[PDB]
Design a protein around this ligand. Structure first.
Ligand code: HEC
Length: 153
């Protein structure tokens, strides 16, 4: 007989949950297309200096984000070790090489050889942190909580 609100002027439905996690602009195609990474200690160590030369002074060597001279710098920094498994190789290699300008874009500051090292040390470190059994959340330090699997306890 009488309608209070007719359904039509509006569309069927277009509700989204936005993006959660990183958010950085990086085409999935650049993230998964080319990434030459040599897996060694030198890539880890030397790759560890790349970021440590200038980036650690604000947020940890690479993943820790413990920052040594960040006390005067902007508010506390995030922990990349927790977000590392969330970031792919092409993405970090893509950001270090092309970046945007402000912070990333060290493709001219570093070489590809370094870029893979930056990718190696973060990739190795982030993984070593997973061993502790924290991947997916915070690290548990409760003794006698681990599942079946001791080996040298
Ligand atoms: C302070 C003087 C900084 C210097 C020098 C560098 N970065 Fe930085 N970076 C800084 C802040 C405050 C933040 C925000 C972190 C937060 O808590 O929100 C960042 C962040 C990044 C990120 C993003 C991390 C992520 O969660 O995805 C990247 C990839 C990054 N910074 C890279 C980077 C590099 C390569 C630098 C050296 C060349 C570098 N930063 C220096 C502060 C500062």
């Amino acid at each position: 007989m009488d309608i209070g609100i007719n359904s039509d002027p509006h569309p069927p439905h277009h509700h989204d949950h936005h993006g959660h996690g990183s958010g950085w602009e990086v085409p999935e195609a650049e993230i998964h297309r080319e990434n030459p990474i040599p897996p060694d200690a030198r890539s880890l160590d030397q790759g560890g200096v790349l970021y440590a030369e200038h980036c650690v002074r604000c947020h940890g060597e690479t993943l820790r984000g413990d920052g040594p001279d960040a006390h005067d710098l902007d508010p506390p920094v995030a922990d990349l070790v927790e977000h590392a498994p969330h970031h792919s190789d092409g993405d970090l290699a893509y950001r270090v090489r092309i970046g945007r300008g402000p912070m990333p874009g060290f493709g001219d500051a570093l070489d590809e050889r370094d870029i893979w090292d930056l990718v190696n040390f973060m990739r190795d470190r982030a993984q070593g942190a997973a061993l502790a059994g924290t991947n997916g959340h915070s690290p548990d330090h409760a003794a006698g909580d681990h599942h079946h699997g001791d080996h040298h306890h």
